[PDB]
Design an enzyme around this catalytic site. Sequence first.
Site, PDB file in Angstrom:
ATOM      1  N   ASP A  39      -0.277  29.560  53.784  1.00 60.50           N
ATOM      2  CA  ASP A  39       1.147  29.798  53.357  1.00 60.50           C
ATOM      3  C   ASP A  39       1.889  30.945  53.956  1.00 60.50           C
ATOM      4  O   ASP A  39       1.726  31.091  55.145  1.00 60.50           O
ATOM      5  CB  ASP A  39       1.265  30.285  51.805  1.00 60.50           C
ATOM      6  CG  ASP A  39       2.262  29.676  51.019  1.00 60.50           C
ATOM      7  OD1 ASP A  39       2.160  28.805  49.996  1.00 60.50           O
ATOM      8  OD2 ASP A  39       3.420  30.010  51.165  1.00 60.50           O
ATOM      9  N   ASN A 161       7.766  17.514  46.591  1.00 63.73           N
ATOM     10  CA  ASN A 161       8.913  17.707  45.567  1.00 63.73           C
ATOM     11  C   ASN A 161       9.997  16.674  45.812  1.00 63.73           C
ATOM     12  O   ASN A 161      11.150  17.051  45.787  1.00 63.73           O
ATOM     13  CB  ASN A 161       9.459  19.101  45.487  1.00 63.73           C
ATOM     14  CG  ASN A 161       8.264  20.222  45.430  1.00 63.73           C
ATOM     15  OD1 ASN A 161       7.542  19.880  44.495  1.00 63.73           O
ATOM     16  ND2 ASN A 161       8.303  21.046  46.469  1.00 63.73           N
TER      17      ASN A 161
END
Length: 279
Positions: A39, A161
């Site tokens: 990340d 998303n």
Amino acid sequence: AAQTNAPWGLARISSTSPGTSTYYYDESAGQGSCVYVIDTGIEASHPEFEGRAQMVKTYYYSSRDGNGHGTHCAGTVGSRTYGVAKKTQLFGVKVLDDNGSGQYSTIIAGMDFVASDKNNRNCPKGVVASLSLGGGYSSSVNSAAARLQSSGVMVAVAAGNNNADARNYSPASEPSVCTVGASDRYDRRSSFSNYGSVLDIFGPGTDILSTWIGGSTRSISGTSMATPHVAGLAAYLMTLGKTTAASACRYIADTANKGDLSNIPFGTVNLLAYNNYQA
Ligand SMILES: [Ca+2]
Ligand SMILES: [Ca+2]
């Protein structure tokens, strides 16, 4: 063990029904397992990680999380207050820049790095990798995720998303990994969550409180938030000896709450991550 007034997501994964506020979990809490968070980095100095987090690799000028996203995800995996597996070891790999962006070549290198690096670590109960990232379909990115899984790491990835079929996104669309959609506290599919046949499991993803940079906290939403719930649950179950890295996604699906979610399109699994804890 029981954590009262827990974040709703932790309570949800230890209950058969929504609306509870206590997180019930075995005291072993993922001790002896390791989770790589791939990340923007991890603010390892955050008090909530209790010295259990460290950066092991960066692909940018610094290993610092200048964004917050990675620190948030890490917190949901294994921070004291906001984490699923409260005693796991956290390893940060910074493949995303401080704007939360990253080239596919860098993301792939980061995955290959973890497959190798785990051989230098003491993780007797097993190794998990949490990937709260993704973009358009790429067979190369899918292949890297498949390699990481094949090497003996439980790979959990965000579905995305876009309120669309995850088949058009990577590494979401790699079938051999664990692809995670998001739900909200009322057991609805999160309005942004991708769906489709490639999804393996749902986890809490709307309004998730966790750690943030500057030693802070904040609540954010996304399939990026659901993924570390599942990654942390995998670490937790591996420590308990219930499953292995190769079979954890399947074990989680097998033991999930079934049929509790609403607004699930036909052809998408109706399965919500659940730790099956009994005192
Ligand atoms: Ca239920
Ligand atoms: Ca899968």
